[PDB]
Amino acid sequence: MIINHNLAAINSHRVLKFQNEEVSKNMEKLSSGMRINRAGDDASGLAVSEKMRTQVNGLRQAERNTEDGMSLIQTTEGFLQESNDIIQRIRTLAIQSSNGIYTEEDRQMIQVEVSQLIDEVDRIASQAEFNKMNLLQGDFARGSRATSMWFHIGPNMHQRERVFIATMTARSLNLKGQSGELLSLSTADKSNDAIGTLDAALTRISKQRANLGAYFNRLEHAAKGLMNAYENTQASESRIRDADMAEETVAFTKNQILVQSGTAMLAQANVRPQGVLSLL
């Protein structure tokens, strides 16, 4: 028997060392909870998982963007409500002032209230704000040269939609003249004409409210779609990258038992060449 080199020991040690490496890989997977932990486990799986992680984060942020856009739309519509109420009041005043039982003084007392209400309309237009951005002055109107409003409702580069808000500044509603003169109710003839102007102003306000409602409804549908997409994408990504802990435990137990058996065999092989010493 050759005692200068123990070949059974060499074989047992090689097998044991590579079994220990398999044990280490299993432990890494079980500790992290992820099937792919270093480059080499699954290269394309890792690439697709990182792309899906990008998509998941983007979908979540885009849903948050959609909610913020809905908040802006709701604020704008709420501000338009007061203008509508004021214009309805002014129309009732115009109906009343057209009657012939009033004198010029009574019509001027009506014009006092009309002037105050027109001023309040203008104040709403110049002061309505969302995150320090003016809304009703025409900054985001269709032909506006000032700025544009876009809501980025997707997780990718060009997935955005434009929102238009028209001018509601008591000049677009024809309640103020070119030179700044107010709509007047001081005569019965002028009160009669003011009824049609107020009707037109109400029509414009209603159209603006309809546009903002359409935007809000679209944004609601988009938010639901984004939530569903995020759930499905996360399911796909986890199906790719997450470790099944039960299967991993099965593998880990098998490899540990193999390690123990190999250690016992290496211990047995180390003591084997001692039997030659009986011949000496």
Which residue range is the domain that position 253 belongs to? 7-33+243-273
Helix (H) or strand (E) holding 259: helix 245-270
* DSSP assignments along 91-141, one per residue: HHHHHHHTSTT--HHHHHHHHHHHHHHHHHHHHHHHH-EETTEE-TTSTT-
In this structure, are 137 and 167 located in the same domain?
A: yes
Q: Identify which of 2, 1, 170, 28 has the alpha carbon closest to the alpha carbon of residue 87.
A: 170
* DSSP assignments along 178-223, one per residue: TTSPBP--SSHHHHHHHHHHHHHHHHHHHHHHHHHHHHHHHHHHHH
What CATH number did the domain enclosing 111 receive? 1.20.1330.10
The answer to whether residue 154 sits within a structural domain is yes
The answer to whether residue 264 sits within a structural domain is yes
Amino acid at the residue 278: S
Amino acid at the residue 175: L
Q: Is the dihedral of CA 82, 84, 85, 87 positive or negative?
A: positive
- State residue 168 phi and psi, 5-degree precision: -130, 50
For residue 2, the tally of other CB atoms under 10 A from its CB is: 8
The answer to whether residue 2 sits within a structural domain is no
CA dihedral 173→179→182→187, nearest 10 degrees, is -120
In this structure, are 145 and 49 located in the same domain?
A: yes
In this structure, are 260 and 193 located in the same domain?
A: no
- Structural domain count of the chain: 2
CB 123 within 8 A of CB 205: no
- State residue 44 phi and psi, 5-degree precision: -70, -35
Label residues 12-32 b or e (16+ Cβ within 10 Å = b): bbebbeebeebbebbeebeee
In this structure, are 179 and 249 located in the same domain?
A: no
Helix (H, G, I), strand (E, B) or coil at 267: helix
Q: Identify which of 181, 208, 159 has the alpha carbon closest to the alpha carbon of residue 59.
A: 159
In this structure, are 230 and 102 located in the same domain?
A: yes
Q: How was this structure determined?
A: cryo-EM
Token pair of 91 as six digits: 């129309």
The DSSP symbol for 250 reads: H
Quote the CA–CA distance of 99 and 182 in Å, as a whole number: 21
In this structure, are 223 and 125 located in the same domain?
A: yes
Helix (H, G, I), strand (E, B) or coil at 83: helix
Please return the burial class of 267, using the count of CB atoms within 10 Å of its CB with bins 0-12, 13-18 and 19+: exposed
In this structure, are 212 and 258 located in the same domain?
A: no
Label residues 70-84 b or e (16+ Cβ within 10 Å = b): bebbebbbebbeebe
The answer to whether residue 280 sits within a structural domain is no
SS3 of the chain: helix, strand, coil, percent, to 5: 70, 5, 25
Quote the CA–CA distance of 133 and 122 in Å, as a whole number: 17
Q: Identify which of 5, 63, 81 has the alpha carbon closest to the alpha carbon of residue 219.
A: 63
The answer to whether residue 143 sits within a structural domain is yes
Quote the CA–CA distance of 51 and 66 in Å, as a whole number: 22
Amino acid at the residue 275: G
In this structure, are 149 and 247 located in the same domain?
A: no
In this structure, are 11 and 51 located in the same domain?
A: no
State the pairing for strand pair 149-151/133-134. unpaired
The answer to whether residue 39 sits within a structural domain is no
Token pair of 174 as six digits: 């024809």
CB 219 within 8 A of CB 69: yes
Resolution in A: 2.4
**Angle between helical axes of 43-97 and 188-241 (0-180°, round to 10):** 170
Amino acid at the residue 35: R
In this structure, are 201 and 255 located in the same domain?
A: no
Q: Identify which of 36, 118, 76 has the alpha carbon closest to the alpha carbon of residue 219.
A: 76
Token pair of 229 as six digits: 């997409």
Q: Identify which of 7, 13, 79 has the alpha carbon closest to the alpha carbon of residue 265.
A: 13
In this structure, are 256 and 219 located in the same domain?
A: no
In this structure, are 103 and 53 located in the same domain?
A: yes
CB 168 within 8 A of CB 208: yes
Which own/partner pairs from 50-58 qualify as long-range (CB within 8 Å, at least 24 positions apart)?
52/233, 52/236, 52/237, 52/240, 53/237, 54/155, 55/155, 55/233, 56/230, 56/233, 56/234, 56/237, 57/155, 58/154, 58/155, 58/156
The answer to whether residue 203 sits within a structural domain is yes
The answer to whether residue 48 sits within a structural domain is yes
Which residues sit opposite 149 in a β-bridge?
Answer: 163
Helix (H, G, I), strand (E, B) or coil at 149: strand
